[PDB]
Design a protein around this ligand. Structure first.
Ligand SMILES: Nc1nc2c(ncn2[C@H]2C[C@H](O)[C@@H](COP(=O)(O)OP(=O)(O)OP(=O)(O)O)O2)c(=O)[nH]1
Ligand SMILES: [Mg+2]
Ligand SMILES: [Mg+2]
Length: 378
DNA sequence: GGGGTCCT
DNA sequence: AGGACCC
């Protein structure tokens, strides 16, 4: 019996922005990347605006829409780490998922609390927030009692986040990662809900597309949808034999457990990042002098990031995207080069070679993306 | 779109 | 090196 919590910040980028220029707190807001509105405050979803939505569809639906550019993730990333560091303080094992989601395993903490309690105040243990599906609490159910303590820690987290960081968000408490994440969004925004075990089927059957299961993306969905498997219950019910023989004993076995609300995966300690990368897409790049400048630019920011980081990377990757999947070359970063200096020149030289490897400087080319990644950190 | 993770 | 997943 684990007690896991999923923390999900409301319209993160927008939130971070609204904290910056408070003048936009009352005004519906979109955060913009090229031609997309990636996220908007609630004041604006109110008006049909949806996450990842065209600026033409955006502006029209709401010509009162305000916009900030969010291509530079710097400030979001920093707040992201302030959030998880904050959660790491409740309990050290925190798993990040993107910039705006965290899992924390609350089991050891829940136990610690209960022991400190006596029969009286156990009376007495109440929920913080919503109980999924208005299910009834049985105070004599040890599992019920533990999930409620969880809800109490969740609430303390949510309050700490707001009081210390001004951030708002949802939490979902449950017995594994799948359910915690599934339940955290039942009441939005800035609310939390807890999942009692006897409501687990209800929760998973509440989904409408098998892709709404975390663990099941485009490819798998499509492959499933071609086997006639469309509902959670189809997947639950479909032939284990056939499914294995179809997506591999690996995928098949686990995504079938997922369909029953079953998820054994541990909450892993994310710790410091295992890669830094910058990218920029564009209409077209067809010269190698543009590239170098672009790449000098990506390489620029990366340098300050790792510089400010305190560890050193031992390999670089260059990623590109061609005219109308991606491609990449990597190589170790040399000994002395891992180090008040002119790291640019040698670095860009490496990237350039790697660059030419993929690109034909003599045969015209059309690139729609450049990216530099520093991995293999020590 | 601008990022990340792990597996193969 | 590429693939799939996540946000
Ligand atoms: N899922 C997804 N998120 C992206 C993408 N590009 C940027 N993001 C960032 C922008 C948003 O701030 C964030 C969306 O994550 P969430 O699903 O948790 O929603 P968000 O926190 O933005 O607001 P919400 O309360 O969920 O409406 O992810 C993308 O391509 N897919
Ligand atoms: Mg959210
Ligand atoms: Mg999914």
């Amino acid at each position: 019996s684990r007690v896991i919590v999923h923390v999900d910040l409301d319209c993160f980028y927008a939130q971070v922005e609204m904290i910056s220029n408070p003048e936009l707190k009352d005004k519906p807001l979109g955060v913009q990347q090229k031609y997309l509105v990636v996220t908007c405050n609630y004041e604006a979803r109110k008006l049909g605006v949806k996450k990842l939505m065209n600026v033409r569809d955006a502006k029209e639906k709401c010509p009162q829409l305000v916009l900030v550019n969010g291509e530079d993730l710097t400030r979001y990333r920093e707040m992201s780490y302030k959030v998880t560091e904050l959660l790491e303080e409740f309990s050290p094992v925190v798993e990040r998922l993107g910039f705006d989601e965290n899992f924390v395993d609350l089991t050891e903490m829940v136990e610690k609390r209960l022991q400190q309690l006596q029969s009286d105040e156990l009376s007495a243990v109440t929920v913080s927030g919503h109980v999924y599906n208005n299910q009834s609490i049985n105070l004599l159910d040890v599992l019920h009692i533990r999930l409620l303590v969880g809800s109490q820690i969740a609430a303390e987290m949510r309050e700490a986040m707001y009081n210390q960081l001004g951030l708002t968000g949802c939490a979902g408490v449950a017995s594994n990662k799948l359910l915690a994440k599934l339940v955290s969004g039942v009441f939005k925004p800035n609310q939390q809900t807890v999942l009692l075990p006897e409501s687990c089927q209800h929760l998973i059957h509440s989904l409408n597309h098998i892709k709404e299961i975390p663990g099941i993306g485009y490819k798998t969905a499509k492959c499933l949808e071609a086997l006639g498997i469309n509902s959670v219950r189809d997947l639950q019910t479909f032939s284990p034999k056939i499914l294995e023989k179809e997506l591999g004993i690996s995928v098949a076995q686990r995504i079938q457990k997922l369909s029953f609300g079953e998820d054994n995966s541990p909450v892993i300690l994310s710790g410091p990042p295992q890669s830094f990368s910058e990218e920029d897409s564009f209409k077209k790049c067809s010269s190698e002098v543009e590239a170098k400048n672009k790449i000098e630019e990506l390489l620029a920011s990366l340098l300050n990031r790792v510089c400010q980081d305190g560890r050193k990377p031992h390999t670089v990757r260059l990623i590109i995207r061609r005219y109308s999947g991606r491609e990449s070359r990597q190589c170790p970063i040399p000994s002395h080069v891992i180090q008040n200096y002119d790291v640019m020149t040698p670095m860009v030289d490496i990237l350039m070679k790697l660059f030419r490897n993929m690109v034909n400087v003599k045969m015209p080319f059309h690139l729609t993306l450049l990216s530099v990644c520093f991995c293999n950190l020590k």
